[PDB]
Design a protein around this ligand. Structure first.
Ligand SMILES: Cn1cc(Nc2nc(NC3(C)CC3)c3nc(CC#N)ccc3n2)cn1
Length: 279
């Protein structure tokens, strides 16, 4: 299905992998899942080039082939010329949800209306993966990309897995479920991580911050339950269109996702249903 590249092609499309900022004159859009991503070109389509480990390259293509959905990023191609490896996708013009929440490079803050659509879209993408018996294992705002219409697209299926335990604990610790940190592999851990994403959407705060109390965003749930704070205290001030009702409705979903006991968390279908009722 995917078009097979050759390293020279990609070297050139990326202006010899100009690994520097776009502001200056480079091509580096960013770095992430065991790699770097630069803006590239294929005739009419702008591509994202993921220059990289081998087993994470092999799995990404495996998962991408069976999992095509409007809320999953689309893989167009790749190149496997030696130890230098490359993955190629439809370029997401509005980058990651993490970067848009932080207004990286001066992009305007996302409105509450836009935030609600992104949360629903991301929940729909997770639903598709769970329906297809796949556990993402690295649900985070850096892995939620935004297209030309700010439609949420789940990315990075390198750690994805098709109850079961592991010796190699992998993921982003600020987003990980307690049982995932203990080696358990369960789709219930993806729900917990999605709860952290929902808190990031409401607050616009990063999942972890050394210079903050609490350092971990997931801990604001406790502050609220203990009444040391309100959700209203944490609503992102960079919005003019949030209303208490839908904000509290999204917080309620986030709160349920963040249950310490995995079996007490809602499944993705209940999450999707609850986010749809919110609007
Ligand atoms: C403004 N801006 C647009 C972009 N576009 C973009 N960014 C991707 N990753 C980021 C966020 C690290 C750079 C990306 N990633 C994949 C999948 C992978 N790897 C597929 C498409 C992508 N498109 C980035 N900043």
């Amino acid at each position: 299905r995917f078009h097979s590249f050759s390293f020279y092609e990609l070297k050139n499309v990326t202006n010899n992998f100009d690994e520097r900022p776009i502001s200056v004159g480079g091509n580096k859009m960013g770095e992430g899942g065991f790699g770097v991503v630069y803006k590239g070109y294929v005739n009419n389509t702008t591509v994202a080039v993921k220059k990289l480990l081998k087993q994470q390259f092999d799995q990404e293509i495996k998962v991408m082939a069976k999992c095509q959905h409007e809320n999953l990023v689309e893989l167009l191609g790749f190149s496997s010329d030696g130890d230098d490896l490359c993955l190629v996708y439809v370029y997401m013009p509005n980058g990651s949800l993490l970067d848009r929440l932080s207004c990286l490079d001066g992009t305007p803050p996302l409105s509450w209306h836009m935030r609600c659509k992104i949360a629903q879209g991301a929940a729909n993408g997770i639903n598709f993966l769970h329906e297809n018996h796949h556990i993402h294992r690295d649900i985070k705002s850096a892995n939620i990309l935004l297209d030309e219409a700010f439609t949420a697209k789940i990315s990075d299926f390198g750690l994805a897995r098709a109850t079961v335990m592991t010796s190699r604990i992998v993921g982003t610790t600020a987003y990980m479920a307690p049982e995932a940190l203990r080696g358990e592999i369960t789709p219930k851990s993806d729900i917990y991580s999605f709860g952290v994403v929902l808190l990031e959407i409401i607050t616009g705060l990063p999942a972890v911050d050394e210079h903050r109390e609490p350092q971990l965003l997931l801990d604001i749930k406790e502050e609220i339950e203990d009444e040391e704070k309100t959700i209203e205290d944490y609503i992102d001030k960079k919005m003019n269109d949030a209303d208490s009702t839908s904000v509290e409705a999204m917080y309620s979903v986030a709160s349920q996702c963040l249950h310490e006991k995995k079996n007490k968390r809602p499944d993705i279908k209940k999450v999707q249903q609850l986010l749809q009722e919110m609007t």
